[PDB]
Amino acid sequence: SQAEFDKAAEEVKHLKTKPADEEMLFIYSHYKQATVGDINTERPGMLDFKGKAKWDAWNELKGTSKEDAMKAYIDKVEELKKKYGI
């Protein structure tokens, strides 16, 4: 299905607490593979500040199925929901 993934991405955007950079990264990444696909973009190039993390962390997913990214993202966000909630 799809609704549960937007539900996850939207829910994360409304969580009561902020999860670790790493979580933000797992999300950011799994969200891009789950919806955009493999990183068909330009890695930082200039500064390796926070962007390198998101870009690279997403790149890391080149080869994983949209569905695995989606599925795992849904559940993972669900973890975050049981973990941090509303």
Side-chain angles (χ1 to χ4, degrees), residues 5 8-9 12 26-27 30-31 69-77:
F5 177 88
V12 105
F26 160 95
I27 296 299
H30 280 251
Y31 179 79
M70 287 169 111
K71 286 170 173 53
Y73 179 102
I74 293 166
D75 289 66
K76 208 288 193 289
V77 163

Side-chain angles (χ1 to χ4, degrees), residues 20-61:
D21 228 294
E22 307 80 70
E23 295 285 60
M24 295 193 84
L25 279 169
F26 160 95
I27 296 299
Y28 189 76
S29 65
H30 280 251
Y31 179 79
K32 294 311 196 61
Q33 179 56 265
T35 65
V36 174
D38 315 272
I39 200 157
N40 282 283
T41 66
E42 311 73 19
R43 178 193 187 282
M46 191 57 267
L47 301 177
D48 277 290
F49 282 42
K50 213 175 196 64
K52 155 174 76 199
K54 273 80 199 316
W55 191 94
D56 295 42
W58 168 19
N59 162 60
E60 180 190 278
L61 309 187

